[PDB]
Amino acid sequence: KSKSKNILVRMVSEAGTGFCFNTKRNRLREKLTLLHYDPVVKQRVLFVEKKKIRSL
Amino acid sequence: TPDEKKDEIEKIKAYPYMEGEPEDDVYLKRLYPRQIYEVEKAVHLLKKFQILDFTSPKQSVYLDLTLDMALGKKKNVEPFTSVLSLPYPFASEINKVAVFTENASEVKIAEENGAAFAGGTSLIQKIWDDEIVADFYVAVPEIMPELNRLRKKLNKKYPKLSRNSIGRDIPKMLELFKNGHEIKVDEERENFLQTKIATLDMSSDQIAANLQAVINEVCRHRPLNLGPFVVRAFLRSSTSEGLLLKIDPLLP
Amino acid sequence: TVIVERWWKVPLAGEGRKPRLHRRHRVYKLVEDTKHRPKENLELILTQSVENVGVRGDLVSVKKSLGRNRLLPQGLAVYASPENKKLFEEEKLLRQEGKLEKIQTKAGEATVKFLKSCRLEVGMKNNVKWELNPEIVARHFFKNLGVVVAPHTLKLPEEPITRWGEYWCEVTVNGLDTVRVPMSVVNFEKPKTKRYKYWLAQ
Amino acid sequence: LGQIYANNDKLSKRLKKVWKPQLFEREFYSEILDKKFTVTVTMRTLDLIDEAYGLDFYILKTPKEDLCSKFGMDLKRGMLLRLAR
RNA sequence: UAGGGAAUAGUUUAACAAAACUCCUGACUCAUCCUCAGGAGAUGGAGGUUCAAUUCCUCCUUCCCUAACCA
RNA sequence: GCUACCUAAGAACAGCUAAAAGAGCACACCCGUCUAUGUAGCAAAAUAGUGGGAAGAUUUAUAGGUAGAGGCGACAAACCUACCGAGCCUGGUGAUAGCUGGUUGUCCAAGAUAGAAUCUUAGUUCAACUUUAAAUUUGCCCACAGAACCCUCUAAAUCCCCUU
RNA sequence: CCUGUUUACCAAAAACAUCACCUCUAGCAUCACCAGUAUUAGAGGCACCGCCUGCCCAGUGACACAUGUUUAACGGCCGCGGUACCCUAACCGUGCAAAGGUAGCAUAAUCACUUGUUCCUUAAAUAGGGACCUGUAUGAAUGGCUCCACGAGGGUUCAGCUGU
RNA sequence: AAUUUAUUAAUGCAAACAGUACCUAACAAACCCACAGGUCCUAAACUACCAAACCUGCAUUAAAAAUUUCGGUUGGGGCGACCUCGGAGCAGAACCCAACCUCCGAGCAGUACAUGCUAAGACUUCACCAGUCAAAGCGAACUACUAUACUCAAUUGAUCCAAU
Numbered sequence A: 001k002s003k004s005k006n007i008l009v010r011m012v013s014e015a016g017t018g019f020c021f022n023t024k025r026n027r028l029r030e031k032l033t034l035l036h037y038d039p040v041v042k043q044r045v046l047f048v049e050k051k052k053i054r055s056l
Numbered sequence B: 001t002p003d004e005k006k007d008e009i010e011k012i013k014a015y016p017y018m019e020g021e022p023e024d025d026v027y028l029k030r031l032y033p034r035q036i037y038e039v040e041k042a043v044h045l046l047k048k049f050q051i052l053d054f055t056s057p058k059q060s061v062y063l064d065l066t067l068d069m070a071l072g073k074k075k076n077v078e079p080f081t082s083v084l085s086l087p088y089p090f091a092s093e094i095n096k097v098a099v100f101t102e103n104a105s106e107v108k109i110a111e112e113n114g115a116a117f118a119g120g121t122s123l124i125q126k127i128w129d130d131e132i133v134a135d136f137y138v139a140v141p142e143i144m145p146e147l148n149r150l151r152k153k154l155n156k157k158y159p160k161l162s163r164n165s166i167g168r169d170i171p172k173m174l175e176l177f178k179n180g181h182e183i184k185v186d187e188e189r190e191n192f193l194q195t196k197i198a199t200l201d202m203s204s205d206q207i208a209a210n211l212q213a214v215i216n217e218v219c220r221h222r223p224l225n226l227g228p229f230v231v232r233a234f235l236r237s238s239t240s241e242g243l244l245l246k247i248d249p250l251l252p
Numbered sequence C: 001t002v003i004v005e006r007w008w009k010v011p012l013a014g015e016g017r018k019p020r021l022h023r024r025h026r027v028y029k030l031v032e033d034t035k036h037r038p039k040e041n042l043e044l045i046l047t048q049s050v051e052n053v054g055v056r057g058d059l060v061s062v063k064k065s066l067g068r069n070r071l072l073p074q075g076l077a078v079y080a081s082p083e084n085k086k087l088f089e090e091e092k093l094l095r096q097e098g099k100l101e102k103i104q105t106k107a108g109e110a111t112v113k114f115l116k117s118c119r120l121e122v123g124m125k126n127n128v129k130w131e132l133n134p135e136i137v138a139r140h141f142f143k144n145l146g147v148v149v150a151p152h153t154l155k156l157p158e159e160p161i162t163r164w165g166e167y168w169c170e171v172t173v174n175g176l177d178t179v180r181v182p183m184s185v186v187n188f189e190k191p192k193t194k195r196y197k198y199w200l201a202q
Numbered sequence D: 001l002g003q004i005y006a007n008n009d010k011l012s013k014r015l016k017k018v019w020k021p022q023l024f025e026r027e028f029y030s031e032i033l034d035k036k037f038t039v040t041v042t043m044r045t046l047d048l049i050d051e052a053y054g055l056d057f058y059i060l061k062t063p064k065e066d067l068c069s070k071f072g073m074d075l076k077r078g079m080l081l082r083l084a085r
Numbered sequence E: 001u002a003g004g005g006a007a008u009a010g011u012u013u014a015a016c017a018a019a020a021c022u023c024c025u026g027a028c029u030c031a032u033c034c035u036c037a038g039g040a041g042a043u044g045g046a047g048g049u050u051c052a053a054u055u056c057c058u059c060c061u062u063c064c065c066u067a068a069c070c071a
Numbered sequence F: 001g002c003u004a005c006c007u008a009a010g011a012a013c014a015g016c017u018a019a020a021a022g023a024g025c026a027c028a029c030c031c032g033u034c035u036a037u038g039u040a041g042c043a044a045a046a047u048a049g050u051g052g053g054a055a056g057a058u059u060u061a062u063a064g065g066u067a068g069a070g071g072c073g074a075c076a077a078a079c080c081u082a083c084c085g086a087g088c089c090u091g092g093u094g095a096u097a098g099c100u101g102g103u104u105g106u107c108c109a110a111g112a113u114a115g116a117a118u119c120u121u122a123g124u125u126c127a128a129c130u131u132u133a134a135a136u137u138u139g140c141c142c143a144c145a146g147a148a149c150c151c152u153c154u155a156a157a158u159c160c161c162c163u164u
Numbered sequence G: 001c002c003u004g005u006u007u008a009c010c011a012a013a014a015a016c017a018u019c020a021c022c023u024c025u026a027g028c029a030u031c032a033c034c035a036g037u038a039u040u041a042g043a044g045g046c047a048c049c050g051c052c053u054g055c056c057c058a059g060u061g062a063c064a065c066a067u068g069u070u071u072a073a074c075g076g077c078c079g080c081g082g083u084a085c086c087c088u089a090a091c092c093g094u095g096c097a098a099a100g101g102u103a104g105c106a107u108a109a110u111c112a113c114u115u116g117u118u119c120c121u122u123a124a125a126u127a128g129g130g131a132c133c134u135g136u137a138u139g140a141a142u143g144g145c146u147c148c149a150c151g152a153g154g155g156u157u158c159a160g161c162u163g164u
Numbered sequence H: 001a002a003u004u005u006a007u008u009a010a011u012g013c014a015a016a017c018a019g020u021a022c023c024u025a026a027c028a029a030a031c032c033c034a035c036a037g038g039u040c041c042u043a044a045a046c047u048a049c050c051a052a053a054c055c056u057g058c059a060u061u062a063a064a065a066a067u068u069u070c071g072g073u074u075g076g077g078g079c080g081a082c083c084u085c086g087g088a089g090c091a092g093a094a095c096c097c098a099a100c101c102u103c104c105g106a107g108c109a110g111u112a113c114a115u116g117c118u119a120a121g122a123c124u125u126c127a128c129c130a131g132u133c134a135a136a137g138c139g140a141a142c143u144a145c146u147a148u149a150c151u152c153a154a155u156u157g158a159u160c161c162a163a164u
């Protein structure tokens, strides 16, 4: 269709719970570190990007 | 990975080798695999050969190494000359080296540190217009533009940042390099490197230390644990056949 | 042998009944062709002496081609059956009934055979005074004849050699078989020099 | 005599395929019959003869359904008749 | 959908002293033509890095070449 | 046993010109150019006249060979037993057909149709309508009140809705 | 070219074959080729003879392999700007390409324009013959152009003949 | 055109089968040695050659083939155009409404990182599928943020299957 501007990445919890969520980021920006609610520990935790799922 | 080069690497691994004398008192060399290993025994035996085959008590021990200097990827690594003195440097003295420095205080530091040939434009022009031979060259960054004239003449032997031979601090190689010994490379690039290690009278421990230093020196080109860098090693004296040392313990 | 298996499951027929085969059960995939398998050796008991192994009653593992196409047809070997193993085992007791047979390894016999048909060229330097002694002689065996000789099992023509001439060095392989080799002592010429002088030119 | 799927993929064409054994002409000696026979054999037959420790044992031990040869069954009758008589 | 490679004078290319070339002057000719010169002529873009980047990295554009690529 | 081509061993070819002939004229013989007749005919390709060839790559009797995913072919997609874009017979076979045609006694009753999807618009499946049976409760007709600004037709009307 | 051959049953012809010419493949025997052996055999194109068959191997194919070779293999064989006033450039400049359609012939059995123009033929000619031709879609062995003889081929015509 | 190489041929590997087996490039510059040659300034490691065909198995490239298909809408078919989604007119006021009717757009982007969990009652593109809105509650945020299902019109794709 058109040149992909953003990409889909898997954000994995740093608490070791294994909970992951997918977010959209710009291809040309740095790897994301986000504070996101982790249901396993039931409180907001830091999440770090691990892998790119696909190009959006 | 050309078939010949890769297949030889497979073949050299295939060659059988064994530890210790076979049970037989008298046995044909053909009947059993390659043997003689321990660096201690090797030195002791090489001295035995010196007496049996009358020859100089002090001889150049020309270590040949089957160093897997290739097969990092399917693209092969290349040969460089990471020069380092052995723990007890052998008696070879080669002291023809040149420092390029013009209209700079480095000219003093160059000679103060034992430069054989120090000069600027006049030295550069001498290299281009007339033949001159040095073992290794160094240049400050300011002189690299002028030195570029000798790039073609030296056929890539001219100073390069890759070899740490371009820098305001000349003593990187200048100070140390005189005593240090060059680890040259094969023309056929079959991984065998004809590099003297020690004089024959040198004590086995010193020759053993001299051996290990080169092992790390040669792995410097590709010192990764990802790909094994060495297969075999033959320690030959000047007047003797090569012996297959057990280098596997000494590799890391 | 080609080994195949069916793509499609065959329904169970039950006890005492034949499977119901549809035409889809004729579709096969090649599991393995056993000709490409690594070859195994054939274990035979030798009857007559052969160059590879020359002891009657020796259990030898040979290539199936060699045993099938040479030894077994010509009577040189027999199958290592339980019965044949017993027959030859009884013989080896009778062989050793008087005393236990001394061990002489097959390798040692081969070195003896090689030593029977070889002559040692002991090139010696003109400049230096030399006397050829057991330790020196063992080294020459390694370089020229290729034999790794124990120094102690060494003999010589009475007095050890000291000048160029013709002599004999008698090596005992494993202490039992003594072979005396013709000894030709010449002026020392490095292998490099001789190959340039004669092998290259001649 | 069977069928195969091209590229071992069921969704591809189904093709006819015949697998034939590799045949070798070899000479064998029968102790009971004291005669040499030139017989076409497979490598499997040679292995089976080796495991039986000879042709005579192979012929006598092997049942009819495994020999799968009229010639083999005739050799068995010949050998058995000499042993019986 | 991927990969790789390429962007040096207006034209391209040397990765090499750098040029040719078009245009534009001149000189040489008794004059004209040929000719011989000079003159300006570039390191895709952008960003960073380094004292200094065609020469270390990165994304984008254009183009070329190759190929997988399941529902 | 037709026909295409081939094999074996046979037969026929007057007269004239030229005398050399895949030469000319012209019978037998082979072929079938043009016209008419005929068109359930004498004939599922004929008759009458007129024509091409007629010692040659000719015509022709006999026996044999090549068989359908094929043969044979001086290629006309020729010919291979009256119908060959690929024979005929039997069998699979009651092939399949969203396509056309057909569908057998008497009498009564209810009964005409918004749309969606689909290699789908010559068809189907779901809605809608329609039919039978069953359950229990509202259905239709409708009074006020109520349902938009932006914008040129300030439309006929509708929706909602007790009462009846 | 000629004799010949073809759609038995609507096409006998300009279609096919053919002498000639040319390309390709093969160094060999006991069933075809052949009881043969490169002056041979087989696979093809074109079509006697006469005068000729021009340029191109980039692409496809075939062959050969270090580049490469091969068109009587499949096929192809340009445009612009200016220069003697217009009708045109021998000539130069210029982009592009493997090469840029050479000889011959030409309103043709040759897209249309088209019943082209002119001469001959008729009282009158969209017919016929000879020329002119840029055919912008002619053209040289998928052959070009002449020329004997031949044709139940297609077209035109003198004279005669006749109920056309 | 998609699918395929069973078939035929060539090639390689394996399978099968015999054995015999080239270790080649000094040079003294100095010194030694009666010679012949040696000491110093490398005298290494390598290690190969290796059974022709037929037959069988597995691959690769060709040859010659086989199987099956060649969408729809359409003022007949073809050609052209079109095929899903949203806004406006036609369709003036609840909903709905067609033409190869008239117009304009979409195949994203941006900000969040509680775009967390859970659950009454409803809407629904005329079926289904899909799609839409939401109180309360849990957990958060919070006592400045038109804060609670983000702005935005469409900004999109079922099942099987694949990857994990």
Ligand SMILES: [K+]
Binding pocket: F042, F043, F046
């Ligand atoms: K008739």
Ligand SMILES: [K+]
Binding pocket: F100
């Ligand atoms: K009808």
Ligand SMILES: [K+]
Binding pocket: F098, F122, F123
């Ligand atoms: K239909």
Ligand SMILES: [K+]
Binding pocket: none
């Ligand atoms: K006919």
Ligand SMILES: [K+]
Binding pocket: G012, G152
């Ligand atoms: K005719």
Ligand SMILES: [K+]
Binding pocket: G057
């Ligand atoms: K070509």
Ligand SMILES: [K+]
Binding pocket: none
């Ligand atoms: K005319």
Ligand SMILES: [K+]
Binding pocket: G151, G153
């Ligand atoms: K005719």
Ligand SMILES: [K+]
Binding pocket: H075
């Ligand atoms: K109409």
Ligand SMILES: [Mg+2]
Binding pocket: none
């Ligand atoms: Mg005949």
Ligand SMILES: [Mg+2]
Binding pocket: none
């Ligand atoms: Mg006649």
Ligand SMILES: [Mg+2]
Binding pocket: F023
């Ligand atoms: Mg005639």
Ligand SMILES: [Mg+2]
Binding pocket: none
């Ligand atoms: Mg005639």
Ligand SMILES: [Mg+2]
Binding pocket: none
């Ligand atoms: Mg006619």
Ligand SMILES: [Mg+2]
Binding pocket: none
């Ligand atoms: Mg007749």
Ligand SMILES: [Mg+2]
Binding pocket: none
């Ligand atoms: Mg014919």
